[PDB]
Every structure is written in structure tokens, then in C-alpha cells.
Design a protein around this ligand. Structure first.
Ligand SMILES: *[C@@H]1O[C@H](CO[C@@H]2O[C@@H](C)[C@@H](O)[C@@H](O)[C@@H]2O)[C@@H](O[C@@H]2O[C@H](CO)[C@@H](O[C@@H]3O[C@H](CO)[C@@H](O)[C@H](O)[C@@H]3O)[C@H](O)[C@H]2NC(C)=O)[C@H](O)[C@H]1NC(C)=O
Ligand SMILES: *[C@@H]1O[C@H](CO)[C@@H](O[C@@H]2O[C@H](CO)[C@@H](O[C@@H]3O[C@H](CO)[C@@H](O)[C@H](O)[C@@H]3O)[C@H](O)[C@H]2NC(C)=O)[C@H](O)[C@H]1NC(C)=O
Ligand SMILES: *[C@@H]1O[C@H](CO)[C@@H](O)[C@H](O)[C@H]1NC(C)=O
Ligand SMILES: [Ca+2]
Lengths: 83, 421
């Protein structure tokens, strides 16, 4: 029994206030996306419960994507945000 | 030498895969030793099909060589019935009974003379060969281990009863690749009805990609491309031991083509070829997959669901779309697909497949192509189910909606959720 932040696509300086109870084996993940849009450049963060995540940093069509993993309640927050 | 038998039995080797240099002569135990048959290893018997020339086709050395690559300690016996295979088709077809009886007599002999176990024998029959292998399996003293049917012949077998063709009873496990089923039943080159424990239909079985206009060893490749493909799929399986191709059970090929049948629950999927799981289902199977035109062959399957949203209420028809997948390992850009119609506040599911090993999905771009006004929808999320990794992925727009506008900039979505099954 672990609780993770579960927030689809939040702006950089928004904190997440939705959480889920993950199931047998699951860990906390966070996907950060930084790149350009029609309306200016944008850092977004997405959070959820996952089975085996691998962290990555990859650049994919000009927008930088980073995935992070962790195994404690409410640990999946963007690297510039606090618990 | 109550052993008159017309068929010949060559034991080829990893270093001599082309010629029939050493023969196992039934009724002559000393021949087995001459030829260095390995009593401690499994045995493949390769049974060719019909041949308008008197000769082996060029696939025979390839299959032998692949089997020895995958199984370097095994015994690969090539059965020669070239003489009977050179007749007019209905004659050669009739001779499948005698070639089968010859092969069963030979196997039964190896069992009586050497206590060689029949559960160490895998028969691989191509075309007419598949039925010769079926009949042989039905006449062995104990049941043989595996029969593999590579596009079993259709004419005079489609409406034949089990004793006279390949059927599931003929071995402990029977797996069949159907690759050239185009035609009306009984007039297809390859048999239409499932005759195995597991029957796989690459590209729905009727015709194979890469077989229309080509560069084409063999007397006339262009005509028998789709038929012969069954063998090259098996070969490709022998060479990709730790990287097989899934095939997915499905109610129909039409259903498969909509992406309704990915899913690997309760043997709803299996591996094509050598690495197959020997399920022996309660009745039939019938499984589907897509493939490439040239070798490696393996492809990755995804289902895509898109809900097209808007306040305004239009329909469009035979609309064309490009979708681009970006993953941790690679990307494949500009995959085409079309939709019968695209109407507001409706959801459409569909199959995407790609030769490219993407890795885990990260970003997904959608382009609405103008047709060979001013219309567009708002899309918030796209759902994707991946067949090979049994994962459901959700992408959502970086902003609150991605506007999809026909003939303009592609809508961009990034992964916001993952799930396994
Ligand atoms: C017949 O095939 C066997 C191998 O059979 C295969 O593996 C078995 C374990 C079973 O699962 C079979 O069903 C399967 O098909 C051949 O055995 C090979 O030969 C010898 C020992 O028999 C091994 O060679 C080496 O010898 C040197 C000494 O100079 C040592 O340094 C090595 O440690 C090793 O012992 C070889 O590993 C072995 N291979 C395997 C896979 O066990 C056998 O050669 C063959 N018979 C004939 C007549 O060719
Ligand atoms: C597609 O389905 C959705 C329903 O889920 C429809 O979206 C809805 O469109 C209505 C227009 O009737 C919108 O209503 C608006 O609400 C705002 C309040 O935020 C108000 O200020 C406006 O006066 C207006 O009434 C709304 O965006 C939206 N509502 C919901 C519940 O989703 C859409 O119209 C449907 N299209 C078709 C053709 O069926
Ligand atoms: C978000 O925060 C407020 C407290 O200020 C609370 O009322 C709300 O319940 C929180 N969200 C959830 C899902 O609990
Ligand atoms: Ca039979």
C-alpha cells in the first residue's frame, strides 16, 4: 500500500493535489516535458502509479522528456518542487 | 528388408546443408552409424512439396541450415519423394498417402531397431509435404512429438477428412502457418480451414506483403512467393530465438484489422514458429499478425483510440491521417492510416503496426492530411494499447486541448499514464 500523485499534464509551477493508492508491485513515477508550443514554451509534469518504470532523459522532436521513479508515498513531485 | 519403400532419407549436417550426401537406408541399421545419427538428440524430418522440375527448391538448404543454427546438436533428415512430387498435381497429391506411409515405416523402424523415442521427432511439411507429414504421424506406433504445417496444400485436402490430411490428431502438437489462402475454398493454394492445435494466419492468410511486383534458386518465385513465405517465416523464427513474433487469437481477420484483437490473456497470444507454446486448446485456435515484406519480418502492433470532440457537428469521409510514435529507443514518423468517417463526439479505434522497435512510448504526433471549408476537432487525450508489451498508455495534450485542423500543423500529445495487463 503506497500513495502516489496522479496528475495529468500540470504547468511547471502548479502543485499536484490528486493521489491514488497503487496496487501490488507498483511505484511512483513523474514525467517532465519541456519544449515549445504555439503559445510560448512550456514545462509540464505528469504523475502516476506504474509497474516497472525505467527513468530516462530523451529529446524526442525538440522537446526534452525526463522520467523519474521512487518507492514512497507522495514522493513523485517535480525536481524543483518539495514534499 | 521387408522394406521396399520408394522415399529416400538423407541426414544432412551443419557443414553440409545443400546436398543429400549421407542416406539412412531403412532395414539397414549400419547406415545410421555410417551417417553419424545422434541417438541422444531430437530429430527434424523435412518433407518437401510438389516440384515441377525434378529437383529440390532453394528453400531446402536454408531451412536445414537454420534448424542447425538453432539446434547444432540435432539430426536434420531431408525426405526425398521428388519422383512422386514431379507428377501432375492430383497424382502427386494422391501420393501423399504413400510418402506418409514410407515416413511412418521409417520412423517406426528407428523406434524398433534403436529404441529411439518418437517424442523426440518434429516433422516439418511444406505444401503437399504437410499432408504427407500428417498421414505419417497418424501411422507411427506411438504419437510423434510435433508436426509443423507450412501452408498445407488446399486443392483435394480442404474438403478431405482427417485420415487423408494433416489434422490435430496426427501428433501430440500440430502448428500450422497459412500464408496463401486467397481463392474460393478448395481452389486456394494453401488450405483455408484450421488443421492444427494452433493455426496462424500472417496478414490474414490470403496473400503476403511483398508479392505483387518484385525482383525474383527457383523455377518461378513470383507465382509461389506467398506460398513459400510460410517457410521463410519459420526460418526467421529459428534465427530469432530470443526475439519472437506474437500472434493474437481473434474472432476474424476483419476484427484483427480494427485492432480489436491484441491481448495476451489466457493464451490469447502465442509465438509464431519454433518457440510456440504447446497449448493444445479445447478446439481450434485461429491467430493473426502483421509482418514486413523482407526478412526480420517481426512488426510491433498497437491499437489507437481517438475521441474527436467539438461543439459544431460535422462528418467527414475516407479521411487520411499520419501518426508518429516517439519512444525511448527509436521513432517511426508518418505512419499512414485512413478512417471510413470522422464525426464529432465519436470515438474511433484502429490498428497501427511498425517495423521499428520504438521502446517505451513518450510522444505521439497526429496529422490530418487534406484529401488528394475549414475543419478541425479538439483532442485532449489519445489511448494506445501495445500488443507486445501488454501496456495501455494514455497521452494528453501539453495544453488543455490539441487542435487537429485538416492540412495543418500536427497535434502533439505526451504520455500522462501507464498500465500493465
Ligand atoms: C550428440 O549430441 C550431444 C549433445 O546433445 C544435446 O545436449 C544434451 C545435453 C541433450 O540435451 C541432447 O538431447 C541435446 O540434443 C553432444 O554432446 C557434446 O559432446 C561433448 C560431451 O558429450 C561435449 O564436449 C566437450 O568436451 C571437452 C573435452 O575436450 C570439454 O572440455 C567440454 O567441457 C565438453 O565436455 C559437449 O559439450 C557436448 N554438448 C552438449 C550440448 O552437451 C555429442 O557430441 C553428440 N554426439 C555425436 C555422436 O556427435
Ligand atoms: C460534444 O459533447 C460535449 C458534451 O460533453 C459538448 O461540449 C459542450 O458544449 C456546450 C455547448 O452546448 C458547452 O456549454 C457551454 O458551457 C459554458 C460553461 O463552461 C457556458 O459558459 C456556455 O454558455 C455553454 O453553455 C460546453 O463547452 C460543453 N459541455 C460539456 C458538458 O462538455 C459538445 O457541444 C458536443 N457536441 C455535439 C455536436 O454533440
Ligand atoms: C486538495 O486540497 C484541498 C485542501 O486545501 C482539499 O479540500 C482537497 O480535498 C484536496 N484534494 C483531494 C483529492 O483530496
Ligand atoms: Ca490426419
Amino acid at each position: 500500500l503506497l500513495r502516489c500523485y496522479t496528475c495529468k499534464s500540470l504547468p511547471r509551477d502548479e502543485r499536484c493535489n490528486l493521489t491514488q493508492n497503487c496496487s501490488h508491485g507498483q511505484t511512483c513515477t513523474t514525467l517532465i516535458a519541456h519544449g515549445n508550443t504555439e503559445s510560448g514554451l512550456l514545462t509540464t509534469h505528469s504523475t502516476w502509479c506504474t509497474d516497472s518504470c525505467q527513468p530516462i532523459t530523451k529529446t524526442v522532436e525538440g522537446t526534452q522528456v525526463t522520467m523519474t521513479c521512487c518507492q514512497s508515498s507522495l514522493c513523485n513531485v517535480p525536481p524543483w518542487q518539495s514534499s | 528388408d521387408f522394406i521396399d519403400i520408394e522415399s529416400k532419407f538423407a541426414l544432412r549436417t551443419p557443414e553440409d546443408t545443400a546436398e543429400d550426401t549421407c542416406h539412412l537406408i531403412p532395414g539397414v541399421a549400419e547406415s545410421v552409424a555410417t551417417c553419424h545419427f545422434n541417438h541422444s538428440s531430437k530429430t527434424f524430418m523435412v518433407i518437401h512439396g510438389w516440384t515441377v522440375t525434378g529437383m529440390y527448391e532453394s528453400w531446402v538448404p536454408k531451412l536445414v541450415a537454420a534448424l542447425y543454427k538453432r539446434e547444432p546438436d540435432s539430426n536434420v533428415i531431408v525426405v526425398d519423394w521428388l519422383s512422386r512430387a514431379q507428377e501432375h498435381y492430383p497424382v502427386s497429391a494422391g501420393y501423399t498417402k504413400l510418402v506418409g506411409q514410407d515416413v511412418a515405416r521409417f520412423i517406426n523402424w528407428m523406434e524398433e531397431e534403436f529404441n529411439y523415442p518418437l517424442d523426440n521427432v518434429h516433422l516439418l511439411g511444406y505444401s503437399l509435404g504437410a499432408h504427407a507429414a500428417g498421414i505419417a504421424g497418424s501411422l507411427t506406433n506411438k504419437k510423434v512429438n510435433r508436426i509443423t504445417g507450412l501452408d498445407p496444400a488446399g486443392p483435394n485436402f480442404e474438403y478431405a477428412e482427417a485420415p487423408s490430411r494433416l489434422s490435430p490428431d496426427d501428433a501430440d502438437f500440430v502448428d500450422v502457418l497459412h500464408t496463401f489462402t486467397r481463392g474460393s475454398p478448395g481452389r486456394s493454394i494453401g488450405i483455408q480451414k484450421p488443421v492444427g492445435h494452433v493455426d496462424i494466419y500472417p496478414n490474414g492468410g490470403t496473400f503476403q506483403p511483398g508479392c505483387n511486383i518484385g525482383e525474383a534458386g527457383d523455377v518461378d518465385q513470383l507465382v509461389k512467393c506467398s506460398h513459400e513465405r510460410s517457410i521463410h517465416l519459420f526460418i526467421d523464427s529459428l534465427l530469432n530465438e530470443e526475439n519472437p513474433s506474437k500472434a493474437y487469437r481473434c474472432s476474424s481477420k476483419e476484427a484483427f484489422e480494427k485492432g480489436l484483437c491484441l491481448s495476451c490473456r489466457k493464451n490469447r497470444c502465442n509465438n509464431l514458429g519454433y518457440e510456440i507454446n504447446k497449448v493444445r486448446a479445447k478446439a481450434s485456435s485461429k491467430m493473426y499478425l502483421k509482418t514486413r515484406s523482407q526478412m526480420p519480418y517481426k512488426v510491433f502492433h498497437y491499437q489507437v483510440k481517438i475521441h474527436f470532440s467539438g461543439t459544431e457537428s460535422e462528418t467527414h469521409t475516407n479521411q487520411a491521417f499520419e501518426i508518429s510514435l516517439y519512444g525511448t529507443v527509436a521513432e517511426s514518423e508518418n505512419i499512414p492510416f485512413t478512417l471510413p468517417e470522422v464525426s464529432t463526439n465519436k470515438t474511433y479505434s484502429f490498428l497501427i503496426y511498425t517495423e521499428v522497435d520504438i521502446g517505451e512510448l513518450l510522444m505521439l504526433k497526429l496529422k490530418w492530411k487534406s484529401d488528394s471549408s475549414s475543419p478541425g476537432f479538439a483532442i485532449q487525450k489519445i489511448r494506445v494499447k501495445a500488443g507486445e508489451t501488454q501496456k495501455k498508455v494514455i497521452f494528453c495534450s501539453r495544453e488543455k486541448v490539441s487542435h487537429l485542423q485538416k492540412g495543418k500543423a500536427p497535434a502533439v500529445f505526451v504520455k500522462c499514464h501507464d498500465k500493465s495487463l
